[PDB]
Amino acid sequence: MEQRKCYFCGKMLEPGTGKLYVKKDGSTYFMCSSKCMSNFALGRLPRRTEWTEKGKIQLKKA
Amino acid sequence: MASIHRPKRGSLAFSPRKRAKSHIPRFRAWPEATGEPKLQSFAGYKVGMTHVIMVDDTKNSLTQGMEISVPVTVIETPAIRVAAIRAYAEDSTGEKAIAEVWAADLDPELKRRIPIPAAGNQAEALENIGKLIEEGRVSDVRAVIYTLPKSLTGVPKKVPDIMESGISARDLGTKFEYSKTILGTLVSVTDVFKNGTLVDTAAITIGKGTQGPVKRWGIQLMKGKHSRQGSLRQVGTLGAFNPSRVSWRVPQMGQMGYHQRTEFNKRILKIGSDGEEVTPEGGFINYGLVRGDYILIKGSVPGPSKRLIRLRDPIRAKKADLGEPNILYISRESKQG
Amino acid sequence: MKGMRSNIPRALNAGAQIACVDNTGAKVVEIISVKKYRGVKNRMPCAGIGDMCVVSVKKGTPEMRKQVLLAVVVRQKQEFRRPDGLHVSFEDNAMVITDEEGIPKGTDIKGPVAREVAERFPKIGTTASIIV
RNA sequence: GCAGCUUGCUACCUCGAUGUCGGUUCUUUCCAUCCUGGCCGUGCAGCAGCGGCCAAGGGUGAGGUUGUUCGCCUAUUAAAGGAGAUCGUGAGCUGGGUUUAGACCGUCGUGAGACAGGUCGGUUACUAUCUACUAGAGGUGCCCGAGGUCUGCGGGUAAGCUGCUUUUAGUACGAGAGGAACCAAGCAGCGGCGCCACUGGUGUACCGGUUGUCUGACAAGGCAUCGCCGGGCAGCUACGCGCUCAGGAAUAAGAGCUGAAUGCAUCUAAGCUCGAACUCUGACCUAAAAAGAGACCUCUUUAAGGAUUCCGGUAAAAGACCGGUUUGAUAGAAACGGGAUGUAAGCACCAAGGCAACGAGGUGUUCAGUCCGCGUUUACUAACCAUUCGUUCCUUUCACUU
RNA sequence: CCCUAACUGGAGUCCGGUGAAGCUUACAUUCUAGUGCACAGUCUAGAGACCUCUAGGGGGAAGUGAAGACCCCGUGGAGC
RNA sequence: AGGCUAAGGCGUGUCGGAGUAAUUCAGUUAAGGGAAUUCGGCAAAUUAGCUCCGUAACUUCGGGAUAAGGAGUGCCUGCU
Ligand SMILES: [K+]
Ligand SMILES: [Mg+2]
Ligand SMILES: [Mg+2]
Ligand SMILES: [Mg+2]
Ligand SMILES: [Zn+2]
């Protein structure tokens, strides 16, 4: 069972669920839900979004 | 005229598409015995769906040996009671009920369905059935069972559901001996079905009420300019000029769902006793949590949650011994997410 | 053809103009029909990843243009599920020119190909730089 | 000779109107069979053809031109058969064509005007009485009274049909080139039935951002399509997911066995064995209103039990259906779990700058605030109080009571 | 359009109030075939059919609306 | 203009209740494809204000022209 981390929120994908998104340059992004995929498609960066682990890391930098 | 062909809209194999006459599915056929005596059917209640990660053990499959995610239906299967033994006589006009003996002690909530048979004739009724079998008046024996939904909490009902189940045995005397062994006992789903085997599921499907031909039969919508001329979800024609009538085969509105349906070759992926193994975080939506022993059926099953699902051993199964599934992960994540 | 392990929706129907992502000189091809596809009344021919289609070269070189060719779709934006429950989707649709047997006419494929076509057509797999 | 699917002939019906062509939608039938099944012949090595016989169960599609029918063409395809149903189908649709009034071109005519040429434009009425069908109810019939479980006279089904690839096998066959079949596996297309763990859509619950304006400002709100934009649980849904065999019997064409007429021979005249995607059975759905109107068991005859009221939803257009009702988790509240959104207001500090007043905004308090048409715990409130039928009604045409 | 889905408001559906019109010789629960002015719910022979009610789309009643505007005929008109 | 509000006029563009089917009138949204629909892109969608840059064939020299095609735009602070 492959352990996969959501690219946006940083949550671990539960097995049998979630999405893999592949860009043209071969870059692959795991999405745990449709919400993370939508926020990724809006151009939002995870570090600017407070509820994600990268947003929490950026805020906790202070 | 040169015609474009289309398969007929829907199946006429389930006509008339009326409401099922009971909330319980009735089995019209029973398979043949292939071993020791046992009940050929069981009844549970549908809880909901989850999915498991299992190793694909299906022989010859492309994904055999690797991890696959398999949707499953969880069905609560509390022990059923064997309420009665019924003997049948076969003649030219088919089977007729000839004898019945009820178990001496029956559950008090059975009164919600029927007035309780007394603890009267059981030895003499059984000896009457034995005499009838010896004199050749009996063609086969069936067991009358009922569920006890009071132990469940997602199913609100306390009134049992009563149905006849076949007994699988090599001979009629063996059937009678086994039925006398099981009469009045509580049979567990492990005493009927084994893990990894195929079964047939019967239930009354989800009721949708009165539905139009587009949803009921899958007729085409009106297309293009016709979509906005006033008949969008209506059938194009009801008939020809001759014959001067609407055929019963013309798709029309009516009751949709709440029919009896039998599915074939649904594999049991796990027989469980601890309901915490399958209940998700936050519970099953609109149901709650599994409490007693349950069963995991691969894929979908007819009916919504809380419907009685009848399980019988397969009548048209193809594959031989499948094995015990290797369930690596049962998903207990929130169905509400 | 040999079955794939994944379930692929036939996302592209006839008339779809798909970017061709090999070095054969075809930039945009339009699906005419789908090989090994019998349809039903009113249904357009449908193609998902791993399918071979008859195409018409809409853009590209003058030599390639207006030619009826065979192409295999290797990327699709419509999500498809792998056997272990993961759903995969690409950023765009892509195809590569091939023959009947499935051998690419080009030599390099810019961009990632789906693993399913890589198994169903091993030469597309070897020709591609990365398989996702 | 057949058919009546082309065009004629005819004038029997219809001129107090049976609405035209083509397409579309939906249903059905025929077989003279295009494919799929079974066969026979071959100038049939195999591959593949050609010809014929049985067979109508299933399939017979997508596009460019043209109003087309028809036909041509394109790429798929197992094949992309033909025809009937008022040239099926306008109280279903469409309106491209034809078939009104306008106008142009050509031709004809002195002219008005005409054309079986072409061209541009040109209103598609009705609340369903009966019948038929699709579904849903109330009765009466049958019937100890009631309930439950069955049976199955019957009705229906395509519930499956068909390809590709692998294997057999680069084998049989063939000089080579080429190249099969039984069995076996997987996948796919179409069809059918169901389902919502997953994924997608929606989600006028909900959460947030923001424009214009109004309620004096902040805060909180109204309105502008839900103002718009972003996200989205439940539910529904498909673009998602599950299941979708045979086997047996009896046959068609046909191939044979035995077998006489006709000493032999003969598949046929009796008899017998095989033999199809057909038929039957088997699956599956439905079915005591099967008038032969069913079987069995249980409970009880002032009862069994049913309905109404009550709290509901696995059900639901009305009816019906399925449940619970204190001996209770049926619904709701409360809290908690599980979720949605995205970090509330106020306060403090910072803020480009401004002498100041102010100051969009940033940071902390704060994964906060708000919200949940899910669950759990929990009788806290509400499932209480009734009513009604199971008696022909009054009567003493009484099995009784002042 | 492939191929439809969900949702919003108004109808519809169900309830209270109000309250018309249009088809109609009669009968009428039909279905098949034939027959017959050769296109029958009523004739003939069969086959079916227990009655009432509700909803529903329009197969049929050669449904209803209009003494056919197409064609011909009339020792009928009108305009040109 | 449109939107939101005064004043003034109204809740009488004079039936209500209920919230549960199909269907229907009018709307919102819609994966992937993008005219494959259709007689025909009918209907719907796209674009859209203002400023600046830039603007073809052809032309009766008037135009075509807003051709086409690009960039910017809110709020706050201080100013010229
Ligand atoms: K036809
Ligand atoms: Mg009609
Ligand atoms: Mg005369
Ligand atoms: Mg109203
Ligand atoms: Zn995530």
Curated annotation (Swiss-Prot), chain A:
Single GO MF descriptor: rRNA binding
Zinc finger regions, C4-type: 6-36
Co-factor binding details: Binds 1 zinc ion per subunit.
SMART domains per record: TRASH
InterPro entries in alphabetical order: L24e/L24_sf, Ribosomal_eL24-rel_arc, Ribosomal_eL24-rel_N, Ribosomal_eL24_CS, TRASH_dom
Record-listed Zn(2+) binding positions: 6, 9, 32, 36
Record-annotated disulphide pairs: none
Cofactor: Zn(2+)
GO cellular component, one term: ribosome
Keywords, alphabetical: Metal-binding, Ribonucleoprotein, Ribosomal protein, RNA-binding, rRNA-binding, Zinc, Zinc-finger
Family of the protein in this entry: Belongs to the eukaryotic ribosomal protein eL24 family.
Designated name of the protein: Large ribosomal subunit protein eL24
Organism field: Methanosarcina acetivorans (strain ATCC 35395 / DSM 2834 / JCM 12185 / C2A)
Swiss-Prot record, chain B:
GO cellular component, one term: cytosolic large ribosomal subunit
GO biological process: translation
Region (Disordered): 1-20
Keyword entries, A-Z: Ribonucleoprotein, Ribosomal protein, RNA-binding, rRNA-binding
One GO molecular-function entry: structural constituent of ribosome
Transmembrane segments: none
NCBIfam families membership: L3_arch (TIGR03626), PRK04231.1 (NF003261)
Function description: One of the primary rRNA binding proteins, it binds directly near the 3'-end of the 23S rRNA, where it nucleates assembly of the 50S subunit.
Quaternary structure and partners: Part of the 50S ribosomal subunit. Forms a cluster with proteins L14 and L24e.
Family: Belongs to the universal ribosomal protein uL3 family.
PANTHER family attached to this UniProt entry: 60S RIBOSOMAL PROTEIN L3-RELATED, LARGE RIBOSOMAL SUBUNIT PROTEIN UL3
Protein name: Large ribosomal subunit protein uL3
Lineage, uppermost ranks: Archaea, Methanobacteriati, Methanobacteriota, Stenosarchaea group, Methanomicrobia
From Swiss-Prot, chain C:
Coiled coil spans: none
Membrane-crossing segments per the record: none
Single GO cellular component term: cytosolic large ribosomal subunit
Annotated Pfam families: Ribosomal_L14
Superkingdom, taxonomy of origin: Archaea
InterPro entries for this protein: Ribosomal_uL14, Ribosomal_uL14_arc, Ribosomal_uL14_CS, Ribosomal_uL14_sf
Gene3D superfamilies with a match to the protein in the record: Ribosomal protein L14
Classification via SUPFAM superfamilies: Ribosomal protein L14 (SSF50193)
GO MF annotation: an example: structural constituent of ribosome
Keyword tags: Ribonucleoprotein, Ribosomal protein, RNA-binding, rRNA-binding
GO biological process: translation
The keyword Ribosomal protein belongs to this UniProt entry's keyword annotation: yes
Protein family membership: Belongs to the universal ribosomal protein uL14 family.
Assembly notes: Part of the 50S ribosomal subunit. Forms a cluster with proteins L3 and L24e, part of which may contact the 16S rRNA in 2 intersubunit bridges.
Function text: Binds to 23S rRNA. Forms part of two intersubunit bridges in the 70S ribosome.
Protein name as it appears in the record: Large ribosomal subunit protein uL14
Origin species: Methanosarcina acetivorans (strain ATCC 35395 / DSM 2834 / JCM 12185 / C2A)
